[PDB]
Amino acid sequence: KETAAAKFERQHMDSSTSSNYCNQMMKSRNLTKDRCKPVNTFVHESLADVQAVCSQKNVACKNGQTNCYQSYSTMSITDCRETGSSKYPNCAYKTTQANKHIIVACEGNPYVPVHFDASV
């Protein structure tokens, strides 16, 4: 299949790029293949900037692990949230643009993002 790092890029990175954004992106990145992923976040910053977060503010992960890092500066992100009318395979999403600090979990050598934990 793919590596944890590759999966993170597929699920959360969009350095390139509306109200239909999430509906298209969640489908394009295969996040609605088996079921409708409840929520997801896309980061519009460069891969370098996001990877750099692994050496920024160390914070506790939501699950209790200690390998999470928070960005020192806010980042342009888009939050995707499944609607009520949404019914698989026709997953409907609410697109919300925002500028917040991101928190990602990092692992490996090279030490890179493998999980999007939260946006604050």
PDB file of C-alpha atoms in Angstrom:
ATOM      1  CA  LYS A   1       0.000   0.000   0.000  1.00  0.00           C
ATOM      2  CA  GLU A   2       1.787   3.138   1.264  1.00  0.00           C
ATOM      3  CA  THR A   3       3.892   4.439   4.162  1.00  0.00           C
ATOM      4  CA  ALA A   4       2.517   6.338   7.166  1.00  0.00           C
ATOM      5  CA  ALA A   5       4.222   9.474   5.837  1.00  0.00           C
ATOM      6  CA  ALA A   6       2.689   8.961   2.381  1.00  0.00           C
ATOM      7  CA  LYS A   7      -0.751   8.442   3.933  1.00  0.00           C
ATOM      8  CA  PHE A   8      -0.408  11.709   5.868  1.00  0.00           C
ATOM      9  CA  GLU A   9       0.392  13.573   2.651  1.00  0.00           C
ATOM     10  CA  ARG A  10      -2.551  11.964   0.847  1.00  0.00           C
ATOM     11  CA  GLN A  11      -4.982  12.670   3.700  1.00  0.00           C
ATOM     12  CA  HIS A  12      -3.887  16.119   4.832  1.00  0.00           C
ATOM     13  CA  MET A  13      -1.655  17.919   2.318  1.00  0.00           C
ATOM     14  CA  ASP A  14      -2.950  20.281  -0.389  1.00  0.00           C
ATOM     15  CA  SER A  15      -0.260  22.865  -1.108  1.00  0.00           C
ATOM     16  CA  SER A  16      -1.855  23.522  -4.513  1.00  0.00           C
ATOM     17  CA  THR A  17      -5.462  24.535  -3.809  1.00  0.00           C
ATOM     18  CA  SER A  18     -14.870  26.616  -2.869  1.00  0.00           C
ATOM     19  CA  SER A  19     -18.017  25.345  -1.135  1.00  0.00           C
ATOM     20  CA  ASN A  20     -17.670  22.080  -3.069  1.00  0.00           C
ATOM     21  CA  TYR A  21     -13.974  21.661  -2.170  1.00  0.00           C
ATOM     22  CA  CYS A  22     -14.428  18.986   0.514  1.00  0.00           C
ATOM     23  CA  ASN A  23     -16.943  16.971  -1.526  1.00  0.00           C
ATOM     24  CA  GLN A  24     -14.399  16.688  -4.337  1.00  0.00           C
ATOM     25  CA  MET A  25     -11.207  16.417  -2.259  1.00  0.00           C
ATOM     26  CA  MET A  26     -12.502  13.765   0.164  1.00  0.00           C
ATOM     27  CA  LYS A  27     -13.383  11.680  -2.900  1.00  0.00           C
ATOM     28  CA  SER A  28     -10.182  12.408  -4.853  1.00  0.00           C
ATOM     29  CA  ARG A  29      -7.905  11.452  -1.956  1.00  0.00           C
ATOM     30  CA  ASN A  30      -9.920   8.243  -1.440  1.00  0.00           C
ATOM     31  CA  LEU A  31     -11.201   9.173   2.016  1.00  0.00           C
ATOM     32  CA  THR A  32     -14.721   8.039   1.080  1.00  0.00           C
ATOM     33  CA  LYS A  33     -13.821   4.656  -0.443  1.00  0.00           C
ATOM     34  CA  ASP A  34     -14.987   2.217   2.241  1.00  0.00           C
ATOM     35  CA  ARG A  35     -17.109   4.710   4.193  1.00  0.00           C
ATOM     36  CA  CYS A  36     -17.588   8.447   4.718  1.00  0.00           C
ATOM     37  CA  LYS A  37     -14.718   9.666   6.907  1.00  0.00           C
ATOM     38  CA  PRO A  38     -16.514  11.815   9.562  1.00  0.00           C
ATOM     39  CA  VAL A  39     -14.002  14.694   9.549  1.00  0.00           C
ATOM     40  CA  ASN A  40     -10.696  15.643   7.939  1.00  0.00           C
ATOM     41  CA  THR A  41      -8.353  18.608   7.600  1.00  0.00           C
ATOM     42  CA  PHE A  42      -6.295  19.742   4.618  1.00  0.00           C
ATOM     43  CA  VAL A  43      -3.213  21.962   5.012  1.00  0.00           C
ATOM     44  CA  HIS A  44      -2.473  24.480   2.246  1.00  0.00           C
ATOM     45  CA  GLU A  45       1.126  25.182   3.253  1.00  0.00           C
ATOM     46  CA  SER A  46       4.204  23.708   1.556  1.00  0.00           C
ATOM     47  CA  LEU A  47       5.365  20.193   2.452  1.00  0.00           C
ATOM     48  CA  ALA A  48       8.576  21.701   3.876  1.00  0.00           C
ATOM     49  CA  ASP A  49       6.655  24.020   6.224  1.00  0.00           C
ATOM     50  CA  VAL A  50       4.486  21.169   7.526  1.00  0.00           C
ATOM     51  CA  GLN A  51       7.413  18.753   7.898  1.00  0.00           C
ATOM     52  CA  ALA A  52       9.194  21.527   9.813  1.00  0.00           C
ATOM     53  CA  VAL A  53       6.503  21.318  12.501  1.00  0.00           C
ATOM     54  CA  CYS A  54       8.182  18.100  13.738  1.00  0.00           C
ATOM     55  CA  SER A  55      10.919  20.253  15.289  1.00  0.00           C
ATOM     56  CA  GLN A  56       8.585  22.912  16.708  1.00  0.00           C
ATOM     57  CA  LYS A  57       6.461  22.987  19.913  1.00  0.00           C
ATOM     58  CA  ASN A  58       6.322  19.562  21.577  1.00  0.00           C
ATOM     59  CA  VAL A  59       2.861  18.933  23.051  1.00  0.00           C
ATOM     60  CA  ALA A  60       0.922  15.899  24.295  1.00  0.00           C
ATOM     61  CA  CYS A  61      -1.116  14.011  21.679  1.00  0.00           C
ATOM     62  CA  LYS A  62      -4.858  13.563  22.205  1.00  0.00           C
ATOM     63  CA  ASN A  63      -4.297   9.849  22.875  1.00  0.00           C
ATOM     64  CA  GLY A  64      -1.643  10.542  25.501  1.00  0.00           C
ATOM     65  CA  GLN A  65       1.474   9.858  23.449  1.00  0.00           C
ATOM     66  CA  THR A  66       4.220  12.491  23.594  1.00  0.00           C
ATOM     67  CA  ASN A  67       5.231  12.763  19.939  1.00  0.00           C
ATOM     68  CA  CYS A  68       2.946  15.646  18.909  1.00  0.00           C
ATOM     69  CA  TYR A  69       4.084  19.065  17.748  1.00  0.00           C
ATOM     70  CA  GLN A  70       2.276  22.376  17.392  1.00  0.00           C
ATOM     71  CA  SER A  71       3.168  24.937  14.709  1.00  0.00           C
ATOM     72  CA  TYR A  72       4.625  28.216  15.989  1.00  0.00           C
ATOM     73  CA  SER A  73       2.662  30.164  13.389  1.00  0.00           C
ATOM     74  CA  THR A  74      -0.897  29.766  12.115  1.00  0.00           C
ATOM     75  CA  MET A  75      -1.397  27.808   8.893  1.00  0.00           C
ATOM     76  CA  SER A  76      -4.009  28.044   6.153  1.00  0.00           C
ATOM     77  CA  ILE A  77      -6.235  24.978   6.507  1.00  0.00           C
ATOM     78  CA  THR A  78      -9.598  23.653   5.366  1.00  0.00           C
ATOM     79  CA  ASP A  79     -11.773  21.592   7.661  1.00  0.00           C
ATOM     80  CA  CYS A  80     -14.125  19.008   6.167  1.00  0.00           C
ATOM     81  CA  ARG A  81     -17.130  17.898   8.215  1.00  0.00           C
ATOM     82  CA  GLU A  82     -19.761  15.351   7.171  1.00  0.00           C
ATOM     83  CA  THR A  83     -23.335  16.650   6.975  1.00  0.00           C
ATOM     84  CA  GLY A  84     -26.524  14.950   8.137  1.00  0.00           C
ATOM     85  CA  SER A  85     -27.937  14.473   4.638  1.00  0.00           C
ATOM     86  CA  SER A  86     -24.671  12.691   3.821  1.00  0.00           C
ATOM     87  CA  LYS A  87     -25.244   9.011   3.033  1.00  0.00           C
ATOM     88  CA  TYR A  88     -22.539   6.678   1.675  1.00  0.00           C
ATOM     89  CA  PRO A  89     -21.542   6.307  -1.146  1.00  0.00           C
ATOM     90  CA  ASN A  90     -22.833   9.885  -1.516  1.00  0.00           C
ATOM     91  CA  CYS A  91     -20.786  11.543   1.222  1.00  0.00           C
ATOM     92  CA  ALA A  92     -21.643  15.225   1.731  1.00  0.00           C
ATOM     93  CA  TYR A  93     -19.200  17.591   3.429  1.00  0.00           C
ATOM     94  CA  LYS A  94     -19.151  21.095   4.886  1.00  0.00           C
ATOM     95  CA  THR A  95     -16.109  23.107   3.767  1.00  0.00           C
ATOM     96  CA  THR A  96     -14.608  25.584   6.233  1.00  0.00           C
ATOM     97  CA  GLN A  97     -11.500  27.676   5.575  1.00  0.00           C
ATOM     98  CA  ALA A  98      -9.471  28.879   8.553  1.00  0.00           C
ATOM     99  CA  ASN A  99      -6.052  29.947   9.797  1.00  0.00           C
ATOM    100  CA  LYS A 100      -5.009  28.052  12.900  1.00  0.00           C
ATOM    101  CA  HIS A 101      -1.994  26.377  14.467  1.00  0.00           C
ATOM    102  CA  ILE A 102      -1.788  22.702  13.576  1.00  0.00           C
ATOM    103  CA  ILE A 103      -0.769  19.792  15.804  1.00  0.00           C
ATOM    104  CA  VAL A 104       0.700  16.707  14.155  1.00  0.00           C
ATOM    105  CA  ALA A 105       2.306  13.518  15.485  1.00  0.00           C
ATOM    106  CA  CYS A 106       5.737  12.669  14.054  1.00  0.00           C
ATOM    107  CA  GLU A 107       7.641   9.388  13.805  1.00  0.00           C
ATOM    108  CA  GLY A 108      10.489   7.674  11.988  1.00  0.00           C
ATOM    109  CA  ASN A 109      13.860   8.506  10.488  1.00  0.00           C
ATOM    110  CA  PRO A 110      13.480  10.958   8.861  1.00  0.00           C
ATOM    111  CA  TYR A 111      11.214  12.265  11.645  1.00  0.00           C
ATOM    112  CA  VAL A 112       8.100  13.282   9.712  1.00  0.00           C
ATOM    113  CA  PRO A 113       4.340  13.883  10.189  1.00  0.00           C
ATOM    114  CA  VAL A 114       2.306  10.654  10.243  1.00  0.00           C
ATOM    115  CA  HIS A 115      -0.904  11.865  11.915  1.00  0.00           C
ATOM    116  CA  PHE A 116      -2.955  15.087  12.027  1.00  0.00           C
ATOM    117  CA  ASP A 117      -3.972  15.494  15.664  1.00  0.00           C
ATOM    118  CA  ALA A 118      -5.779  18.832  15.876  1.00  0.00           C
ATOM    119  CA  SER A 119      -6.028  22.488  14.897  1.00  0.00           C
ATOM    120  CA  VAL A 120      -5.963  25.194  17.577  1.00  0.00           C
TER     121      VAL A 120
END
